[PDB]
Design a protein around this ligand. Structure first.
Ligand SMILES: [Zn+2]
Ligand SMILES: [Zn+2]
Lengths: 309, 309
C-alpha cells in the first residue's frame, strides 16, 4: 500500500521549507503543509507542478505568515506562530483520515518563544489527550520498542503503569507497523519484574498488568509473546516490536545496538508523528545549501520503521 | 601476575574430577580440591606428578568420601556431602589468602538432597555474610556488569539499594578486574533513574546513593564515570566494568550482545567464585569421555573476565 505523509515545513524563514520541497522532489508514500508562497519560493528555485490540494509536488496551503515577514532567515513572532500552525493543520488532516503520519520539519525555539513547541505533548494537546497517552516508539539496529512509560523516576513509572497504558502502547505499535507494511506484527511484552515476576516469586505486577493484557490482545487475534524477562525476550529475532515498561528497559537495548543510528516517533494519538529538527539553518537559509538527508531519514522511519546504519 | 584458582572437583562420582584433572593437565594461572583418591583415579588414567600440597598437577586433599562410596557414577548422601566439603575447603583457602578464585565443578542436586547446594548463598554463608552482600558479575560480548541488586521485584530492589551496596559492588568489581590483569579499571555507574535523575528532575535517588558513592570512590583514586543514564553509559567502550542498579539493567545489554556466549561469577565475599555445572555426567562418568571445555571456559572467565564468542 502507500502511506500518506504530511510534512509540516517548519520555520518558514528556516531551512525546513527547502528540505521539505527537496524531499518531495526526490519522490513508497508526500503532502506539504505550509504557506504556499513560502513553498513556491523554494520550488521554483529547483523545479514540477505544485498543486494546492481529498486526494489525487502536492501541498496544502496553511495561511499564517504575513508576506512581509518572509525573510530567510531571521525569525519573528509570526514565523514561530506559523511553524505551529502548519503542524496543527497537518494533525487536523490526520484526524480527518487524510494523512497517516505527520513530520515536523526543523523549527526555531527562539521564534516560538517570541510568539506565545515541545511536540509529543503539543501533539497530545491538539489530539485531545494527556501527554501520558502518547508513547515513544524508538527504532534502530533492527529493534522497534514502544515505551509504556518514559521520562520520570523509575518508582513513579512503576506506579503509573496499568493495563490501560500497556494495552494502548501495544495496539498503537501494531497499527503503526501495519501502516509500515508489517501485516502481522509479532508483539513482545517485556516483564515489569525480572523474569516477568517468575510465577509471582518477584511480585505480582505482571500478573496484574501485562499477563491480562497479553491474554486480551491474543483474543483479539494478535500474536503476543510474553510477558517474559526482557533480557530473554530481546534475544528473540521473531519479534517485530517490543513494549518496554520503563525508559531504560527500551533505551538500553536500542542505543547499545544502534547508538546514534536510531530515531523516535510518537504513536498513540491516532497519528504517526516525528520531528526532524536540529534547529533552523538560518545562516544557510535561502542558499539551497540544505541537505534533505535527515528528513528523508524521518520519512524512511515513519514508512518503514527502520533506520539505516 | 598469576592468579591461583581452586577447582573444587564436584561430585566425586560424577564428571567433575575427570574434567578437573583434564583442565589441570592442559596447563596464566591451578589447585584441585577433593579426595586425593578420587583425583588419583582420574590422573593415572590420563597422566604427570601430583603433589599433595603454602605453595610452590597440584591438589589439596579434602577428606570426605568413604572409599566404599566411590563408584562412578551413582551418588550417595556421602558423595553429595563431599561436593560441598570441597567447596568449603576451597573457600577456607581463599579466606587464608591462598587462593584467588574458587570454581565449583559439576554436582548432583539429588545427592545434595540425599545428604542434608545453591552456591552464591552457600558461598555467602561460609564467608560469614548475608546473601545480599554477594553480587553477580555477568560477562559477555566485551561487557562486564556487577549487579547491586538482583533477583527480586524491581519496586523491592529500588528499596534495597543504598550507598553501601553500590560502593561494595563497585570495589569488588575493581578488585576482581585487578586480579584479572586490569590494572586500572574504569568503572561506569548506571543511573538509578533515567538520565541518572536529570539534575533531580526525575527524583533524588542518584543524588542520594550513586553520586555520593561516585565522589567517594574517585577520592580513593578510582576512575569513575557517572552516574549517567544507562542507555548512554553502555555506549562507552572506555568503561572496563559497569555497576547495574537492578537485574534488567545489566541483564538486557549482556544478553542482547552476547546471548548464550556469556557467563557469571559472584564477587564481594572476598573470593572470585563461579560454578560450572550442568549436572554430573553420571552415565559417562569413568569413561574419560567428558570434555573439559565448559570448565576451561570458567577458568578463562575468572582469570581474564572474558567469554569467547
Ligand atoms: Zn531519555
Ligand atoms: Zn535472572
Amino acid at each position: 500500500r502507500a502511506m500518506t505523509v504530511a510534512l509540516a515545513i517548519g520555520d518558514p524563514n528556516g531551512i525546513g521549507p527547502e528540505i521539505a520541497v527537496k524531499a518531495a522532489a526526490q519522490m513508497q508514500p508526500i503532502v506539504l503543509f505550509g504557506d504556499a508562497f513560502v513553498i513556491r519560493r523554494y520550488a521554483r528555485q529547483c523545479c514540477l507542478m505544485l498543486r494546492l490540494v481529498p486526494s489525487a509536488i502536492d501541498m496544502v496551503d496553511v495561511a499564517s505568515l504575513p508576506a512581509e515577514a518572509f525573510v530567510p532567515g531571521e525569525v519573528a513572532a509570526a514565523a514561530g506562530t506559523a511553524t505551529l500552525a502548519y503542524v496543527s493543520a497537518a494533525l487536523r488532516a490526520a484526524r480527518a483520515g487524510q494523512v497517516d503520519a505527520v513530520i515536523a520539519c526543523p523549527h526555531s525555539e527562539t521564534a516560538i518563544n517570541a510568539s506565545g513547541a515541545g511536540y509529543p505533548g503539543f501533539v497530545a494537546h491538539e489530539m485531545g489527550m494527556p501527554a501520558e497517552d502518547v508513547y515513544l516508539l524508538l527504532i534502530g539496529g533492527g529493534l522497534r520498542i514502544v515505551h509504556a512509560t518514559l521520562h520520570e523516576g523509575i518508582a513513579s513509572a512503576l506506579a503509573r503503569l496499568d493495563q490501560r497504558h500497556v494495552e494502548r502502547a501495544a495496539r498503537a505499535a501494531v497499527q503503526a507497523l501495519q501502516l509500515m507494511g508489517i501485516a502481522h506484527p509479532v508483539v513482545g511484552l517485556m516483564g515489569i519484574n525480572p523474569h516477568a515476576g517468575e510465577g509471582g516469586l518477584f511480585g505480582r505486577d505482571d500478573i496484574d498488568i501485562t499477563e491480562p493484557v497479553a491474554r486480551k490482545l491474543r483474543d483479539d487475534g494478535m500474536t503476543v509473546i510474553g510477558p517474559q524477562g526482557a533480557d530473554l525476550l530481546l534475544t528473540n529475532p521473531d519479534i517485530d516490536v517490543f513494549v518496554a515498561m520503563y525508559h531504560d528497559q527500551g533505551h538500553i537495548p536500542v542505543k547499545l545496538r544502534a547508538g546514534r543510528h536510531s530515531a523516535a516517533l510518537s504513536i498513540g494519538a491516532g497519528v504517526l508523528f516525528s520531528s526532524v529538527g536540529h534547529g533552523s539553518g538560518f545562516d544557510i537559509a535561502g542558499t539551497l545549501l540544505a541537505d534533505p538527508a535527515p528528513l528523508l531519514g524521518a520519512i524512511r522511519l515513519v514508512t518503514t520503521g527502520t533506520v539505516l546504519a
